[PDB]
């Protein structure tokens, strides 16, 4: 006994009936970049020694 709808025997009119989840697709022309490695760029300022 498993109460999970793993396999149904459906009619052909019910094939497109699982379209109920909302996806969000970003645009093709716009870009997506990962700047996680950009949180470490930067030079240490040297203190003036004479």
């Amino acid at each position: 006994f498993i109460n999970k709808r793993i396999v149904e025997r459906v009619r052909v009119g019910q094939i497109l009936a699982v379209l109920n989840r909302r996806f969000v697709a970003y645009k093709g022309k716009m870009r997506i970049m990962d700047i996680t490695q950009s949180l470490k760029m930067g030079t240490k300022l040297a203190a003036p020694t004479v």
């Binding site: 093709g28 022309k29 870009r31 997506i32 970049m33 990962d34 700047i35 490695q37 950009s38």
Partner: protein, 95 residues
């Protein structure tokens, strides 16, 4: 010829270091924009329809827009087009 450039006192006279112009900065300004984008795309992951930032010769373009100003739309003929014709059938009074 311009009274804004008459050196009467020796305070505004020094060495001459470099020299720029019009068509030396415009090709330069397009290089420093595309090189800043090709750098920060080649450092991290991106997801883009790939385009290649090149710099065209600006001096050929301004020498070509002026070349469109010499073109002529109209033309000058001595006779118009034929605009009409005829087909002779087997008759001799109806075409």
């Amino acid at each position: 010829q311009r009274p804004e450039r008459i050196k009467t006192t020796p305070y505004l006279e020094g060495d001459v270091l470099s020299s720029d112009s019009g068509p030396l900065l415009s090709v330069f300004a397009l290089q420093e924009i595309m090189q800043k984008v090709r750098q920060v795309q080649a450092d991290y992951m991106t997801a883009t329809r790939e385009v290649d930032f090149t710099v065209p010769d600006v001096q050929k373009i301004l020498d070509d827009i002026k070349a469109l100003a010499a073109e002529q739309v109209y033309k000058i003929v001595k006779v118009p087009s034929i605009s009409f014709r005829h087909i002779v059938m087997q008759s001799r009074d109806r075409v």
